[model samples]
Target chain A: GGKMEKITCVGHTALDYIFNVEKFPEPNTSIQIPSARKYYGGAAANTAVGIKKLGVNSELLSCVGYDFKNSGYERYLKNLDINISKLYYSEEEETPKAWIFTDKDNNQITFFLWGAAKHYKELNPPNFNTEIVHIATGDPEFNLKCAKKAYGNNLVSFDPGQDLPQYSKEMLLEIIEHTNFLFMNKHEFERASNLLNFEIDDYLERVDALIVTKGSKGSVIYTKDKKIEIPCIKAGKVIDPTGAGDSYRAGFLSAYVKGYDLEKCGLIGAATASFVVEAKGCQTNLPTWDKVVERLEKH
Target chain B: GGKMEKITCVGHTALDYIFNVEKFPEPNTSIQIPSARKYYGGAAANTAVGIKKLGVNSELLSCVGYDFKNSGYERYLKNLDINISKLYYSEEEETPKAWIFTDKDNNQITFFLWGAAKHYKELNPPNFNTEIVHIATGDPEFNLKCAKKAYGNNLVSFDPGQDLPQYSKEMLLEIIEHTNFLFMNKHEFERASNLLNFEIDDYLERVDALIVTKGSKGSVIYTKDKKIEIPCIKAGKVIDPTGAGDSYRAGFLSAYVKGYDLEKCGLIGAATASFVVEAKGCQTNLPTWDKVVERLEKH
Candidate 1:
């Protein structure tokens, strides 16, 4: 049995506008979208929701608009029993939104509009104690502040997902030095490494463990003593791949906090991500711990 | 005093993402945005909000997502005393959104996404009686249905502002035949006329009056026996001109239903638009009737 511990997920929560197109258009060309939908997303927000669905206690510490108090996203998080007491509200800003275009091949391109999410500078980490705190994609300055603050007080994990390009070398190095666990996808890892003029070994020396995900091929974990390879659990269908990485982080953290081995944590992550791609949106079709175990047994 | 009969503004209510850049970029070129803001917009939504600000009784008849019932835009309308009982909520759709890019010269380009707005086919016009019904850019089929429904029962006004290029010849002809007041800007008029293979006089003969607006220059109104030229009222500064047309329509209609002459209607319209352009967004800086009168008298 897994123990449930309070985990704080820090980043942005945004409304995602998803457009389904037949093909990706060439630059300077136009294409008509056949269908479009909107959903709740943001790396940290998705991770928080996933953690809750897996029978763990989680909280979201993000900035939202004054409108969020009465928004559907607010009601959604409330219904899921995710604590939002630390959420910051901005009177002069609207909730953030992401425009995502997915083609027939399941390829996605995203344009993010930072609305109230831009007010992260006005927020500070709450005094509440938690077993772990994870910082995902958000304002670089705010993420750095959270990382520095959590270094001595709590177990800090960092995932600079889509915002990797915006990080300067100094800021990246500072955050990496303070991070206990480092997470990135293949492209993000390469980009971050290039920006910092560092390789995998350099980053691994700074953080306790480094996790790099490679889509369908699975993920790799490098600890101080050894490197571990974990194969991906195949999904029934890849309806949308928007939040798979975030879900993976949620699963990994959930297992890690329970004192599971690095191999078990990686396997749990692979299993969690399989359910995310089987549905349309990032928050849809999240599996419980029992569901994860059931699927993991078959694998 | 103006009559307080209900005016139903029919179309979409959407979130507008406005980006301010120094200049429009060339194909394959990129420019950094200096500022960005979000506001509630969409032709009918703006008009309804504008009319409400002018002390008129108005209602919005449109489709929205399940989120809209608790969204900021919803609260905005509710606080303004605008009736939204006829608004439809779609479980499968998200709210609509528009991306607007404005250059230093105030020239603009827009990309609109129809989320729940695309589900207008699932909605039918409400049975509530009103003194007037104005249809703006929206789902073409839905707009056509609204125009047809408003024809015999209400004073129908039609403005195919941006959706002119999407209308077929037959659809244009049908809407034109039923429209009591046909509204278009100079460019939209040219495009619509070309598609219908009709000149200005042909369109004038089909509708009671034809209104054509020209940015910064002025507007023209053609009746059975008269041509009225209305000069543009100067704004304190043209901050953003995105929703000036919709504001103008609101002002014009507010005066029209009160038995004002064509000249007065156009002047009020121009005066109302002046205030809108002085601000950054459509719904911001809307003038009351007294404000319009004061400005119009000075001009």
Candidate 2:
């Protein structure tokens, strides 16, 4: 590896229950499917894998259920070379798992998400010497406390995935008070910011930098000085959209660790997502530095 | 023409308000733009022009407001070899206009639509021994009556644009009851069909054939016999999305009139849309038969 930079990631690490159907099912009716597969996922785990795959030294600080041995989750993470020194394995609860159903449009519809991660209320704050800290949604208390502790020390990138609605608008705003960069896909962004009723102008003022992804349209980033729109990096084929956002964050942060500008970081994020989408699962087809450079040049 | 069959398209013919804004506006706040252009476009008119440019014989049945003379909309249609014999000229109302604001994604947010064509409630349907009758949203009464007249006489391809919301579900259902084929982009299909409540499986039983498009994922056709998924045809570069859907309808009808298979017809439609999107205005860069075939062979 070139030069190593420390990055810390916090959230739930879950096993992904994947169903690969020929096409999206017609509502209220069932169709015969050919095959299905399960993999390891969850925003935190996915982003950790993404960062590691991008040639960065990253550590995952997650609460894994104690039933992990039987689930074979630990072996999977070990295989990916992700640093899990900060993992807090639970013996009393089960690891989290998410059901991912992907269609031909690279659109994924997730069903159930359950794991021992919900018991994270009793967890202790993480202590690490890291340059950047990225946190995805899990136990709000755990995430917010960790953010408070990491404040002023590390550059924090916060991805408030699904729990935004659970928090009051004022509380949600406070949770991200120390956030240096805020990331979320289009739908999440709309919900978390109460954007349906709030103006875009008002929202842009609250964050240091904001990135809103529009699927094939890539992402739009708003900084204090400029608003930049990056083109999506087209892939050969979209097999699944299981962990695209997590992978995007990883790729983006990896480039950021290397001191690239905002546009370059967004491009890298898009490039990583392009490769991840071509394969059936996340981390399976992440492009190497050479592959990413080749794709960028060709595009 | 290779044993050509004619198609009649009835709808509005309008002057489009094209704004080349550098970015999407923040809510309630407007940014002055450096460039803007006025182009001629309407769902039906674009389809008619697309068909004629594809080496097929097509006639447009539309009513333009008196502004056509000063707005130069009539000249644009005449230049495309579109037959305007049935177009009504109204001196009292403004031409229907769509204020299109496009950002870096090539995605557009439209506003401003008011024209004399919607008052086509007084006009008589065109008389032609056409093989296909393609009706897009404009005037509900005109569309409903035209559907009745073409019930068994011709193959009706209905693109029920936003007008479905203006009429009752019963009225929309009545119109679909006689349609030979239904064409709609993803969003329009949801609005017209009340898709959130009804399943596609249930909807397909009543409709003869359904064509659903998913941007770069291409389109799918569900018939009683089988389900056909067409691979996406990438447009080299998207200059404007003004008339893409209308152009797609023309392509589908043009090829269907020539007895092409459903897949081939869809491909032709995709190919035609690819060409139209790469240019600025409707009918401005529509591909010829030879050009389209070349693109199909390569794409």
Candidate 3:
């Protein structure tokens, strides 16, 4: 285990349209437009961008359609020094798109494509000989194949997003078996299992390493039987929380690939989230490595 | 209206024995206490004390007894420049006491006065001369009598504490009728209405100004025609939350007595509560006028 060099992100990619408003819209009520911004999103893409920002070799193993002007999304990732060689762009259809609404608390709700990210099944991991593969939420068949491929030699960090509901308990367990680390939010944890029925002790037994994030209270991580709780980096001001979780995962995995301990991994996550939430767009507010280090110093 | 000259406290006054621990003790589980502290408490006393600290002349119109050497308690208030002359101290009975255990979250469960502060019926306000009479939770007789006196001329800030179960719907209505500012936390609001199917909208109609505090979300103050939502001031760190609400009331009343606007008043409350929760005791960590000003400036 000569310290994992490149981290491969296996998941979906999407174009995100974000809006900046004073508050969330009322149900069935229409409001005048304030401002609109577009950016590259989807859990995997955000995480991959975050990893590159943290000074790491990140390869995005995603499938996007060539049609509907998807070239801009690809070029942005390339500019960030993230490998897009394995990206599958289908000329027959448009890439997936996500419309996210955010509130004052920086909490977000998204309306996204049901099946626009199903094109990555044809790609293989042979393009990059990476020691670690970070699997984000997407097609079950593709995730399972990647998980199997990275079984013994490579460390697999699974960010299942909200796709947990689609898989059975047995399938989740299988994913957990090969997972070096599992990242999920409070709601996702509850959906995974009725793990909320038991206290923190009960949850630690289910996986090798787990990070459970409880909004303002902060995030908790269980690694090697030791529990580490980290406070949220006080986001200076909450602008938009569209991709906070994905950015946090990328920060954590980046630190992990660099052989940092669990505590530092959590700090990276909190710092990344704090920076990302201060601006309107998903990746627009992504802080430089120096800024990330400066934030970590405060916490 | 003439500027409020004094704060009238018509509620229970007690000695609070607080234990600052990492976690609250489970029922029937005995745990070693790491630290023990005491302070002046009860919603009325706290606000009165807060007013005195704010350089206003204040008085407590509640009863306290001399048993268990409670003259020391009066000295505690006198030291803060609060007028304890109107307080009826009984030679035959003990002052009420609160055994509070607080956790890191500032969440607390308390065992309050059994019968010590029950005899506040004998004590009453003098001449109703003050411009503001803050009627917090205490004797119903005093609450009703003061309500009749301060109906319109004087400003009355009423806070219904845990004594909700003691008063009837009519009593609550009577207090609301005379109250210039009615403050209640989320749990107390739900409980006081007898589970009435009411929300923030319904609460506004009953009082001149209604403040509903949703713990971490901060508070919302509803006036006759508008709703002002104030976010909680960010606390640097939270150690024990024993008297956070009482401290908040003090801060709000202090600012209100000084003619601060609704938003500024809420900010004062938030700032005071933030400071109070950072330390072990309420009065110990209560911020001074300069600190409050500093927090306001930063935010």
Candidate 4:
């Protein structure tokens, strides 16, 4: 496909509070908070920001709440040149929130509150003409509707994340029927594989590209004929891995829209992820295209 | 088959606290606890006591905890001439407890504490010479173990109660393979039917008899060639119906041991259930055989 311009990020738009912690406590043991820091997060919103930061035009198609109107997150996105015209807003609900902890190994545990995101159940899917539709975790029914109704040169990249268990096998398979790029971490891939009775190659056979992230171990982009292993790029010491996966998607998608091949897209994804992990928050260390271009080889 | 004698009831041995309420409260609303009373309960224990009281020998092959030793429940069962030699005891665990509410229609809602029943996971199934083993709700593995190891002349009557969700379809079907009398309330039967792809007649063909209880509407005893609907027998004014199902099972088994026909067994089951609901607690108004006999023709 030729170089494309637009993508629509569909899922939750939430605020995340980060906590630094030691090793995860044993079951039944108590732990202290230590410290708490806030960040603009939620999988889709994070990826959308990354997409805009990486030079691709992106539309934010997620639900927000009354708390979002004056939260300054809207002003921040508009300043980044991200399209917010299509986002659904609810007055009765509070903005969704995520409380997260990251240990020394960059391993994370998250507790999420689905506040305003509940509006997704009642709202209709907005029609869009973005080149790619990145469907991250949100309401399953809304995602299914969005997947089923896609028109024109639209490709769906489904990343169910931790919400995979919320889908019925039948509903999930039906969504996958329209999916182009099925993105998941290894754990999610393992769960989906079990639920759908899909072996590794089965996913490759079904989707145009199956991208499975292995955290610090790197990622694999599986197409019908190739398995491309993208090594992890450590731009600097890992300070946080909060929005690492979202950054990966942003870089890969930005490059994909710029007419880069799939393998190169994956490398760019890893490079962007390296920048995200070099800071305590998601957007703190996002890299410019030329910045990533200068360090492409040694990785 | 000729008349039998001994029966061993295997499963949870819980203490129940009854809270009398005007009606079942709506979800997300608060209700006051008007009054509360403690009673000897747990499906297997309730059935075992009823069996002994109805002139058949019965053993309490269930688990108990430290509190049970001084609770006076043991002495109460002993006074009824029920056997407790095979009961398992756990010092680290508190006795299992059921907190229940009843409406004027005799409808109930129960919240159960697994407590001492966890000991069933570590304990071995006891070898018993009792003619019948009534397997009520407790630990799944323990129940399956008990069902599979029943030797000659030892029939198993399986009643999974509310713990039906704990079983895998395969494990449930395996237990059904060795069951003689499969006892279930309508909801449990519906769940098992959905889980096992089982039709009504499929259960009849798998087990010697499929006994299904419909609260207030009475019960049905389904043999391979017969479907006998046993009408409800209202002995007196309805009170608390906490242990009605267990009482039904107890009377049915007691009557079966006396060589009554399957239809007559269901009739006796209904008769016992009637007596249970006539009083505030399970055994308070348990009828004698003569009392049941006198009311039999009227039903």
Instruction: Find the 10 residues in a row with the least total lDDT in model 2 chain B.
Output: B26-35
* lDDT by residue (tens digit), candidate 2, A1-299: 11137788888787665554445433222222233455777678888877877778788988887667645667777877778888887776667655444455655544433457756777777665788888886777788888777777777789877666566776677766767788877877778757335455555666677888877889988887889898999999887676678888888888899789999889888888899898876667877756776788888
Q: Could you give candidate 3's per-residue lDDT for residues B159-231 as a string of tens digits?
A: 7766665667776777777778889888788787655455665666667788888767899888878888888
Instruction: Write down the TM-score for model 1.
Output: 0.77
- lDDT, each prediction: 0.83, 0.74, 0.71, 0.80
Colliding residue pairs in candidate 3? none
User: What lDDT score is found at residue B56 in candidate 2?
Assistant: 82
In order, the first chain's TM-score in every candidate is 0.92, 0.87, 0.86, 0.90
Q: Candidate 2's residue-wise lDDT over B1-299, tens digit each?
A: 11127888988676665555555433222233333456767788888888988888888887777667645767767776777787788777656666454555655544444557556877768655678888986787889888878867887788776565566777777887778888877777777657335556755766777898766678888888878988778888987666677887888888888789998998998888889888888767888877888999998
Clashing pairs in 4: none
Candidate 1 deviation (Cα RMSD): 5.7
Q: Is the docking of candidate 1 incorrect, acceptable, medium or high quality?
A: incorrect
DockQ of each: 0.11, 0.01, 0.01, 0.01
Residue B65, model 1: lDDT of 81
Residue B257 in model 1: shift from native, Å? 4.7
What TM-score would each prediction reach against the true structure?
A: 0.77, 0.47, 0.46, 0.48
Error of 4 at A289 (Å): 60
Q: Give me the runs in candidate 2 sitting further than 4 Å from their true place.
A: A1-299, B1-4, B22-31, B102-107, B193-205
Off by over 4 Å in 1: A1-8, A13-40, A49-132, A149-155, A288-299, B1-42, B48-133, B138-156, B223-229, B253-265, B288-299
Q: After superposition, how far is residue A210 of candidate 4 from its true place, in Å?
A: 65
Best by lDDT: 1
